[PDB]
């Protein structure tokens, strides 16, 4: 028995139940910002404002700027990120999420600007293929812990094929201090920085930027953003 675990196969007893329990968990969550953020709705603006600053460097600076035609919000829920981060920056946004009721609520939550959400894909990321040469930005936030290592590596590889020229993938998510930790309540994992780095490398992706989110509640996991292509 090792000092700690470092991959999902060490903490997930039954992959089918890992996914089915997670789907059941999200079906029971209110379709609200505080539901998306597990009781942390009060820090949504802190999150979004840092994400905007992080992303704007790729859209506004450099000789090979990331485009603003189309973004994909992965694990989008009701569209908290689509509303305040993506729709103001991209002409069109697509959303993908496993929970249909969140995509339904999105149509109300997003309001008039939600008319620029094109596709509402109801699908688990582990079964989702983003269209080749389709997105300038693929935003993956607070959902990677719901995929096994093999599914996450393969999903990221499919995302890479989906990027337009100069496009990027952004992962923004919880990072454990060490190892891989199972949350048996929502049926998710939290991985350390080295594990995530290994998975990113295995998908064929290169790291463009890495940033720890400042100003978050003291008691929560650290949150990191990775820009990849």
């Amino acid at each position: 028995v090792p000092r700690g675990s470092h991959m999902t196969s060490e903490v997930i007893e039954d992959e089918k139940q890992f996914y089915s329990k997670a789907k059941t968990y999200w079906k029971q969550i209110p379709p609200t910002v505080d539901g998306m953020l597990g009781g942390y709705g009060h820090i949504s603006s802190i999150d979004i404002n840092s994400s905007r600053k992080f992303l704007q460097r790729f859209l506004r600076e450099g000789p090979n700027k990331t485009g603003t035609s189309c973004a994909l919000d992965c694990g989008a829920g009701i569209g908290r990120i689509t509303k305040r981060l993506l729709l103001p920056l991209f002409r069109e946004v697509d959303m993908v999420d496993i929970t249909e009721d969140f995509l339904v609520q999105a149509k109300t939550y997003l309001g008039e600007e939600g008319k620029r959400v094109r596709n509402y894909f109801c699908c688990g990321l582990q079964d989702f293929t983003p269209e080749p040469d389709s997105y300038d930005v693929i935003w993956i936030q607070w959902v990677i812990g719901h995929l096994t290592d093999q599914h996450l590596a393969e999903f990221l590889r499919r995302c890479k094929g989906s990027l337009r020229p100069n496009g990027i993938i952004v992962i923004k998510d919880n990072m454990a201090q060490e190892g891989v930790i199972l949350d048996d309540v929502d049926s998710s994992v939290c991985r350390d920085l080295d594990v995530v780095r290994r998975i990113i490398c295995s998908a064929g992706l290169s790291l463009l930027a890495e940033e720890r989110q400042e100003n978050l509640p003291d008691e929560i996991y650290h949150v990191y953003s990775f820009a990849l292509r």
């Binding site: 998306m36 953020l37 597990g38 942390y40 820090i43 607070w142 919880n174 201090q177 930790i181 949350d183 939290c190 978050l216 509640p217 008691e219 929560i220 996991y221 949150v223």
Partner: peptide, 6 residues
Amino acid sequence: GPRRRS
């Protein structure tokens, strides 16, 4: 989303 550390 955000989660209290284990």
